[PDB]
Coordinates of C-alpha atoms and ligand atoms in Angstrom, one line a residue:
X1 CA -36.7 -18.7 26.5
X2 CA -35.3 -19.5 23.1
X3 CA -31.9 -17.7 22.7
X4 CA -31.6 -14.7 20.3
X5 CA -28.9 -15.5 17.6
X6 CA -26.2 -13.0 16.6
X7 CA -24.3 -14.2 13.5
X8 CA -20.7 -12.8 13.3
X9 CA -20.9 -9.1 12.2
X10 CA -17.5 -8.3 13.9
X11 CA -17.5 -5.5 16.6
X12 CA -21.1 -4.6 15.6
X13 CA -22.4 -8.1 16.4
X14 CA -20.4 -8.3 19.5
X15 CA -21.7 -4.9 20.8
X16 CA -25.3 -6.0 19.8
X17 CA -25.0 -9.3 21.7
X18 CA -23.6 -7.5 24.8
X19 CA -26.6 -5.0 24.8
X20 CA -29.2 -7.7 24.3
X21 CA -27.6 -9.9 27.0
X22 CA -27.3 -6.9 29.5
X23 CA -31.0 -6.3 28.9
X24 CA -32.0 -9.9 30.1
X25 CA -32.2 -11.5 26.6
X26 CA -30.4 -14.9 26.3
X27 CA -28.0 -14.6 23.4
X28 CA -26.1 -17.1 21.2
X29 CA -23.2 -15.4 19.4
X30 CA -22.1 -17.4 16.3
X31 CA -18.5 -17.0 15.2
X32 CA -17.7 -18.5 11.7
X33 CA -13.8 -18.0 12.0
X41 CA -9.4 -10.3 11.7
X42 CA -6.2 -11.2 13.7
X43 CA -3.7 -13.8 12.6
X44 CA -0.7 -15.2 14.6
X45 CA 2.5 -17.0 13.4
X46 CA 5.8 -17.8 15.2
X47 CA 5.1 -15.5 18.2
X48 CA 4.1 -12.6 16.0
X49 CA 0.5 -11.2 16.2
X50 CA -0.8 -9.6 13.0
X51 CA -3.9 -7.4 12.9
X52 CA -4.9 -5.1 10.0
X53 CA -8.3 -4.5 11.8
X54 CA -8.4 -0.7 12.3
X55 CA -6.3 -0.1 15.5
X56 CA -7.1 3.7 15.6
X57 CA -8.9 4.6 18.8
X58 CA -9.5 8.3 19.2
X59 CA -13.0 8.2 21.0
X60 CA -13.4 5.1 23.3
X61 CA -16.7 6.5 24.8
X62 CA -18.9 4.1 22.8
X63 CA -16.8 1.1 24.0
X64 CA -16.8 2.3 27.7
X65 CA -20.6 2.7 27.4
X66 CA -20.9 -1.1 26.6
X67 CA -18.9 -2.0 29.7
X68 CA -21.1 0.5 31.8
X69 CA -24.2 -1.6 30.9
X70 CA -22.8 -4.5 33.0
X71 CA -21.7 -2.0 35.7
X72 CA -18.0 -2.6 34.6
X73 CA -15.2 -0.4 33.3
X74 CA -13.2 -0.9 30.0
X75 CA -9.9 -0.8 31.9
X76 CA -10.7 -4.0 33.9
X77 CA -10.8 -5.9 30.6
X78 CA -8.7 -3.9 28.1
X79 CA -5.8 -1.5 28.6
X80 CA -5.7 1.4 26.1
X81 CA -2.2 2.7 25.4
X82 CA -1.5 6.3 24.2
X83 CA 0.0 6.6 20.7
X84 CA 2.6 9.5 20.4
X85 CA 2.9 11.2 17.9
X86 CA -0.5 10.4 16.4
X87 CA 1.3 9.7 13.1
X88 CA 4.4 10.7 11.1
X89 CA 4.4 12.0 7.5
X90 CA 7.5 10.8 5.7
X91 CA 8.7 12.3 2.4
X92 CA 10.9 10.2 0.1
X93 CA 13.2 13.3 0.2
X94 CA 14.0 12.7 3.9
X95 CA 11.7 15.3 5.4
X96 CA 9.5 14.3 8.4
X97 CA 6.5 15.8 10.1
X98 CA 5.3 14.4 13.4
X99 CA 1.6 15.1 14.1
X100 CA 0.2 15.6 17.6
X101 CA -1.9 18.3 19.4
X102 CA 1.0 20.1 21.1
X103 CA 1.4 23.6 19.5
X104 CA 5.0 23.8 20.9
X105 CA 6.1 20.6 19.2
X106 CA 4.2 21.5 16.0
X107 CA 5.9 25.1 15.9
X108 CA 9.4 23.6 16.6
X109 CA 9.0 21.4 13.5
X110 CA 7.4 24.3 11.4
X111 CA 10.5 26.4 12.4
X112 CA 12.8 23.7 11.0
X113 CA 11.0 23.8 7.6
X114 CA 10.5 27.5 7.3
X115 CA 10.9 30.1 10.2
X116 CA 8.4 32.5 8.6
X117 CA 5.7 29.8 8.7
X118 CA 5.5 29.8 12.6
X119 CA 3.8 33.3 12.4
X120 CA 2.0 32.2 9.2
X121 CA 0.6 29.2 11.2
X122 CA -0.5 31.4 14.2
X123 CA -2.2 33.8 11.8
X124 CA -3.8 30.8 10.1
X125 CA -5.2 29.7 13.5
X126 CA -6.3 33.2 14.5
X127 CA -8.2 33.7 11.2
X128 CA -9.8 30.2 11.2
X129 CA -10.9 30.5 14.9
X130 CA -12.5 33.9 14.0
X131 CA -14.4 32.3 11.1
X132 CA -15.8 29.5 13.3
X133 CA -16.1 31.5 16.6
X134 CA -19.9 31.7 16.5
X135 CA -22.7 29.2 15.4
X136 CA -20.3 26.2 15.1
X137 CA -20.2 23.3 17.7
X140 CA -18.5 18.2 18.7
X141 CA -17.4 14.7 17.5
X142 CA -13.8 13.5 18.3
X143 CA -11.7 13.4 15.1
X144 CA -11.3 9.8 13.6
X145 CA -8.1 8.9 11.6
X146 CA -8.8 6.6 8.6
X147 CA -5.5 6.0 6.9
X148 CA -7.2 3.3 4.7
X149 CA -9.9 5.7 3.4
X150 CA -7.1 8.3 2.6
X151 CA -5.1 5.7 0.8
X152 CA -8.1 4.3 -1.2
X153 CA -8.4 7.9 -2.6
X154 CA -4.6 8.6 -2.6
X155 CA -3.8 8.5 -6.5
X156 CA -6.5 11.1 -7.0
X157 CA -5.7 12.8 -3.5
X158 CA -4.3 16.1 -4.8
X159 CA -6.9 16.0 -7.7
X160 CA -9.9 16.2 -5.4
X161 CA -12.0 19.4 -4.7
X162 CA -11.7 18.9 -0.8
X163 CA -7.8 18.9 -1.2
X164 CA -7.7 21.9 -3.6
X165 CA -10.0 24.0 -1.3
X166 CA -8.1 23.2 1.9
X167 CA -4.7 23.5 0.2
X168 CA -5.6 27.1 -1.1
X169 CA -6.8 28.0 2.5
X170 CA -3.5 26.8 4.1
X171 CA -1.4 28.3 1.2
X172 CA -2.9 31.8 2.0
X173 CA -0.8 31.7 5.3
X174 CA 1.8 28.9 4.8
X175 CA 4.5 29.2 2.2
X176 CA 6.4 25.8 2.7
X177 CA 5.2 23.1 0.3
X178 CA 5.7 20.2 2.7
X179 CA 3.8 22.2 5.4
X180 CA 1.0 23.0 2.9
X181 CA 0.8 19.2 2.2
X182 CA 1.0 18.2 5.9
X183 CA -1.8 20.5 7.0
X184 CA -4.0 19.7 4.0
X185 CA -3.5 15.9 4.6
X186 CA -4.4 16.2 8.3
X187 CA -7.6 18.2 7.4
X188 CA -8.8 15.4 5.1
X189 CA -7.7 12.7 7.5
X190 CA -9.6 14.1 10.6
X191 CA -12.5 15.0 8.3
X192 CA -13.1 11.3 7.5
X193 CA -14.7 11.8 4.1
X194 CA -12.3 13.1 1.3
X197 CA -15.9 18.5 2.7
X198 CA -14.3 21.8 1.4
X199 CA -14.7 23.6 4.9
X200 CA -11.6 24.1 7.1
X201 CA -13.7 23.6 10.2
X202 CA -12.6 20.0 10.7
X203 CA -8.8 20.9 10.8
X204 CA -9.5 23.7 13.3
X205 CA -12.2 21.8 15.4
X206 CA -9.6 19.1 16.1
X207 CA -7.7 21.6 18.3
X208 CA -10.9 23.0 20.1
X209 CA -10.8 19.7 22.0
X210 CA -8.2 17.6 23.8
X211 CA -8.0 14.2 21.9
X212 CA -5.4 11.5 21.4
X213 CA -4.7 8.2 19.7
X214 CA -5.1 5.0 21.7
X215 CA -4.1 1.4 21.0
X216 CA -5.4 -1.6 23.0
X217 CA -2.6 -3.7 24.7
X218 CA -2.6 -6.9 22.6
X219 CA -4.1 -5.1 19.7
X220 CA -7.5 -5.8 18.1
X221 CA -7.6 -9.4 19.4
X222 CA -7.4 -8.3 23.0
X223 CA -10.3 -5.8 22.5
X224 CA -12.4 -8.7 20.9
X225 CA -11.4 -11.0 23.7
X226 CA -12.3 -8.4 26.4
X227 CA -15.8 -7.9 24.8
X228 CA -16.3 -11.7 24.6
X229 CA -15.3 -12.0 28.3
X230 CA -17.8 -9.2 29.1
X231 CA -20.5 -11.0 27.0
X232 CA -20.0 -14.3 28.8
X233 CA -19.9 -12.6 32.3
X234 CA -23.4 -11.3 31.4
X235 CA -24.4 -14.9 30.7
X236 CA -24.0 -15.1 26.9
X237 CA -22.7 -18.1 24.9
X238 CA -20.3 -18.2 22.0
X239 CA -20.5 -20.8 19.3
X240 CA -17.2 -21.2 17.4
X241 CA -16.5 -22.5 13.8
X242 CA -20.2 -21.8 13.2
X243 CA -20.5 -21.9 9.4
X244 CA -24.2 -21.1 8.7
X245 CA -25.7 -23.4 6.1
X246 CA -29.3 -21.9 6.2
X247 CA -32.2 -20.5 8.2
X248 CA -35.3 -22.6 9.1
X249 CA -38.6 -20.8 8.5
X250 CA -42.3 -21.1 9.6
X251 CA -44.4 -18.4 8.1
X252 CA -42.6 -15.0 8.1
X253 CA -40.4 -16.0 11.1
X254 CA -37.0 -17.8 11.5
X255 CA -37.5 -20.9 13.8
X256 CA -33.9 -22.1 13.8
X257 CA -30.3 -21.4 12.6
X258 CA -28.6 -24.4 10.9
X259 CA -24.9 -25.0 10.8
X260 CA -22.8 -26.8 8.0
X261 CA -21.7 -29.4 10.6
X262 CA -25.3 -30.5 11.3
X263 CA -26.1 -28.4 14.4
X264 CA -29.5 -26.7 14.7
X265 CA -30.2 -23.9 17.1
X266 CA -33.8 -22.9 17.9
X267 CA -34.1 -19.1 18.0
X268 CA -36.4 -16.1 18.9
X269 CA -34.6 -13.7 16.5
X270 CA -31.6 -13.5 14.2
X271 CA -29.2 -10.6 13.8
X272 CA -26.6 -10.5 11.1
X273 CA -24.5 -8.4 8.6
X274 CA -25.9 -7.2 5.2
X275 CA -26.1 -10.3 2.7
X303 CA -12.0 4.1 -5.9
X304 CA -8.7 2.2 -5.6
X305 CA -8.3 -1.3 -4.0
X306 CA -5.7 -2.0 -1.3
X307 CA -2.8 -4.5 -1.2
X308 CA -2.0 -5.7 2.4
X309 CA 1.4 -7.1 3.4
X310 CA 2.0 -8.4 6.9
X311 CA 5.6 -9.0 8.0
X312 CA 7.5 -10.1 11.0
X313 CA 11.2 -9.1 11.7
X314 CA 13.8 -10.4 14.1
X315 CA 14.7 -6.8 14.9
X316 CA 12.7 -4.0 16.5
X317 CA 12.8 -0.8 14.4
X318 CA 12.5 1.6 17.3
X319 CA 13.1 4.6 14.9
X320 CA 9.6 4.3 13.5
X321 CA 6.3 6.0 14.5
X322 CA 3.4 3.6 15.2
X323 CA 1.5 5.1 12.2
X324 CA 3.6 6.2 9.2
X325 CA 2.2 7.9 6.0
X326 CA 4.8 7.5 3.2
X327 CA 4.9 10.1 0.5
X328 CA 6.6 9.5 -2.8
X329 CA 6.9 11.2 -6.3
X330 CA 3.8 10.7 -8.5
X344 CA 4.8 19.6 -4.6
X345 CA 5.8 16.5 -6.7
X346 CA 5.0 13.9 -4.0
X347 CA 1.8 12.1 -2.9
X348 CA 0.5 9.5 -0.3
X349 CA 1.8 6.1 -1.5
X350 CA 2.2 3.7 1.5
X351 CA 0.9 3.3 5.0
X352 CA 3.1 1.5 7.5
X353 CA 1.7 0.2 10.8
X354 CA 4.5 -0.5 13.4
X355 CA 2.6 -1.2 16.7
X356 CA 5.6 -2.6 18.6
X357 CA 6.8 1.0 19.5
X358 CA 3.6 1.1 21.7
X359 CA 3.0 -2.6 22.4
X360 CA 5.9 -5.1 22.6
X361 CA 3.6 -8.1 23.2
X362 CA 2.7 -8.2 19.5
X363 CA 6.0 -9.9 18.6
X364 CA 8.7 -12.0 20.4
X365 CA 11.5 -10.2 22.5
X366 CA 13.7 -8.0 20.2
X367 CA 11.3 -8.6 17.3
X368 CA 8.9 -6.5 15.3
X369 CA 5.4 -7.0 13.8
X370 CA 4.4 -4.8 10.8
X371 CA 1.9 -4.3 8.0
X372 CA 2.0 -2.1 4.9
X373 CA -1.0 -1.0 2.8
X374 CA -0.4 0.0 -0.9
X375 CA -3.1 1.5 -3.2
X376 CA -3.7 -0.7 -6.2
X377 CA -6.2 -0.5 -9.1
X378 CA -9.7 -1.9 -8.4
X379 CA -10.1 -5.7 -9.1
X380 CA -11.0 -6.4 -12.8
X381 CA -10.1 -2.7 -13.7
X382 CA -6.4 -3.3 -14.8
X383 CA -6.5 -7.1 -16.0
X384 CA -3.9 -8.1 -13.3
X385 CA -2.7 -11.6 -12.3
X386 CA -2.4 -11.3 -8.5
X387 CA -0.6 -14.7 -8.4
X388 CA 2.4 -13.1 -10.3
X389 CA 1.7 -9.3 -9.3
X390 CA 1.4 -9.9 -5.6
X391 CA 4.9 -11.5 -4.9
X392 CA 6.4 -8.8 -7.3
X393 CA 4.7 -5.9 -5.4
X394 CA 5.7 -7.5 -2.0
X395 CA 9.4 -7.6 -3.1
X396 CA 9.3 -4.0 -4.4
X397 CA 7.7 -2.8 -1.1
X398 CA 10.4 -4.7 1.0
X399 CA 13.2 -3.1 -1.1
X400 CA 11.7 0.4 -0.8
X401 CA 11.1 0.2 3.0
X402 CA 14.6 -1.1 3.5
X403 CA 16.2 1.6 1.3
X404 CA 14.3 4.5 2.9
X405 CA 13.0 3.6 6.4
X406 CA 14.1 0.2 7.7
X407 CA 17.7 -0.9 7.3
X408 CA 18.5 -4.6 7.1
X409 CA 14.7 -5.3 6.5
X410 CA 15.1 -8.4 4.2
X411 CA 17.8 -10.0 6.3
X412 CA 15.5 -9.7 9.4
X413 CA 12.4 -11.4 7.7
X414 CA 10.9 -14.3 9.7
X415 CA 7.4 -14.4 8.3
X416 CA 5.1 -12.6 5.9
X417 CA 1.7 -12.8 4.1
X418 CA 0.0 -10.9 1.4
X419 CA -3.7 -10.0 0.9
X420 CA -4.3 -8.9 -2.7
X421 CA -7.7 -7.8 -4.2
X422 CA -7.9 -11.5 -5.5
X423 CA -7.8 -12.8 -1.8
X424 CA -10.7 -10.4 -0.8
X425 CA -13.1 -12.4 -3.1
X456 CA -40.4 -10.2 4.7
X457 CA -38.9 -12.0 7.8
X458 CA -40.4 -10.6 11.0
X459 CA -37.6 -11.6 13.4
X460 CA -34.5 -11.0 11.1
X461 CA -32.4 -7.8 11.9
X462 CA -29.5 -6.3 10.0
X463 CA -26.6 -5.1 12.2
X464 CA -26.0 -1.5 11.1
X471 CA -16.0 5.9 12.1
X472 CA -13.9 2.7 12.8
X473 CA -14.4 0.3 15.7
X474 CA -16.4 2.9 18.0
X475 CA -18.6 3.7 14.9
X476 CA -19.4 0.0 14.3
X477 CA -20.2 -0.4 18.0
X478 CA -22.4 2.7 18.1
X479 CA -24.5 1.4 15.1
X480 CA -25.3 -1.8 17.1
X481 CA -27.0 0.5 19.8
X482 CA -29.9 1.4 17.3
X483 CA -30.3 -2.3 16.3
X484 CA -30.4 -3.3 20.1
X485 CA -33.1 -0.7 20.8
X486 CA -35.3 -2.0 17.9
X487 CA -34.7 -5.7 18.8
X488 CA -35.5 -5.0 22.6
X489 CA -38.9 -3.3 21.6
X490 CA -39.9 -6.4 19.6
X491 CA -38.6 -8.9 22.2
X492 CA -40.1 -7.1 25.3
Ligands
CL1 CL1 -7.4 -5.9 -12.0

């Protein structure tokens, strides 16, 4: 049988290839060339937030395997930390005792205000309401961050929290969490409350994103699939309304039954950096608030070494920071000059407020500015973070299997 070709498509393409291969279809997975490594430091900005691994576990169950045999998921505690430039901190988790102890520190009166807020909200959603595990997208929150407090979803949730909670930092903390677990900055408080109706946590794969990719590739190969590396697609070869073969830039030609591939608000500035010191005082996920309450979401810091020390050399740290920037073309910016300047301003800010001796500890770093981000019968388009990408591959697999079998 001619193999079925899956062209890149990240976690979606990898999940699709696994489901086709598990079903008896010979697959060729083409990787063009999400995780970068330099001087012993491992850098991934590929969404690390795992709250619901069930869609991943479901792929491994198809081969009669378990995810744990290939990938170890590490619990992240707290889920994240909210940091105000003023020095105030709020550690988010699902433990009412640890939440109340923090609320007590901001405003004693707000512990009862919080309990009353939960009692009222539970009563509203007691009947006729179901659900889905909350998914944390710091990127999506940050891409809407300048206009965060401006939004109708924020205003509505803020006024609902404000009816019970008097403290400004606490009104901001709960409103932020509601919009974060909601996924789409939805005026209804159900999302904030539903989060607690279920036992959920934050997980991180040992080795990060790269180890999850590698475990899925190993699963794919154990099922009999083949991986083509440095596969730069030049064009498709056609006969009638069908693709006969996939052609690569290097001259390789692969005969195929079917082809599956990917489709073909503020911007974000990414800054990866490696330090020769492990900042053990940081949370894995940090949401930084700054002025222009008179403070809003300004930086996201990912410090995965507090959970996984394998991401950097011994006594070192691997980090990334996201900063919201105007959309490319929108502010007539020269990212060749603006990028190094923003990088240096970010370093100074993080050192001043959260990471002492940052600059003197720098080993390596890299920026990704908005500039850097620049009929057929047997052709299929592949397509909530990683589990959401993986789950969308399930529908493509079903459709492809019906046409192949
Ligand atoms: Cl611009």
